[PDB]
Amino acid sequence: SDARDLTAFQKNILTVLGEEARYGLAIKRELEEYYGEEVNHGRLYPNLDDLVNKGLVEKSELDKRTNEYALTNEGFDAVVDDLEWTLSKFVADADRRERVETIVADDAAALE
Amino acid sequence: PDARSDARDLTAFQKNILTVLGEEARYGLAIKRELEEYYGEEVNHGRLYPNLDDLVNKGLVEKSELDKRTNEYALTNEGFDAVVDDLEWTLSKFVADADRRERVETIVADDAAALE
DNA sequence: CGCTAGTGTCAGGGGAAATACACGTCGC
DNA sequence: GCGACGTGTATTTCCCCTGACACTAGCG
Ligand SMILES: [Mn+2]
Ligand SMILES: [Mn+2]
Ligand SMILES: [Mn+2]
């Protein structure tokens, strides 16, 4: 029972940080775009500080007023593991595998 | 209907129910068991069955009669799109480098070799 | 006809979200 | 110094889960 009992909201913040470390309101904006609604910072911050104290996020300082949050490798392990569990249960056919890799081929083609 | 309108607001519990049925359609306690092996704890059916009743009214899970004491649950088309759409988001936030990408390429290569 | 499998379900307890309230700071 | 930035936080709210209590239907 490591990354299992996380909340949907929380793991979203984990996959957010997998792309690159960000500073807070930078997370609110990207979460606002996935959900499709305003995410109130009263909800964001408190959940962040629960991951830090469980060893999945590190709340390093950037300004006198800005913080930079990033994934501890223990938190990065949480991202990869339940990504394996979904790929485990998704890739159950030839054509499903051909779909996952054509997804990842496009994802890396936009990388630049 | 689009699955992102609905599937993006679901519980972690509910999203795990989805990924499970994305493997194959199963009946009630088959989900319960194969969810327990993922969590590691117990999964009270008093929580399970209602969470499936939620997914069937949003049009993502189908409920049919195998016999009149056992129903078989399965993802429908909107349900299937909800599973892949959540996969397309996770991947793009994880595929950020050749290093990250390959780790995926070998994760699926292993799971595809495990189908024999 | 006992006993289990298989689901229904609801009052009760629990815990995070809304929605305000608040204060330092960079910027200009 | 006056504006928005960036973050803290609480308590009231609300909703989901925990924990029974229940009922049918197969299996013998
Ligand atoms: Mn806000
Ligand atoms: Mn039970
Ligand atoms: Mn894509």
From TrEMBL, chain B:
The keyword Glycosyltransferase does not apply. Gene3D superfamilies: Winged helix-like DNA-binding domain superfamily/Winged helix DNA-binding domain (1.10.10.10). SUPFAM superfamilies: Winged helix' DNA-binding domain. This is PadR family transcription regulator RosR. One of its GO terms (molecular function) is metal ion binding. Mn(2+) 2 binds at residue 51. Mn(2+) 1 binds at residue 38. Mn(2+) 3 binds at residue 105. Keywords: Metal-binding. The keyword Metal-binding applies.
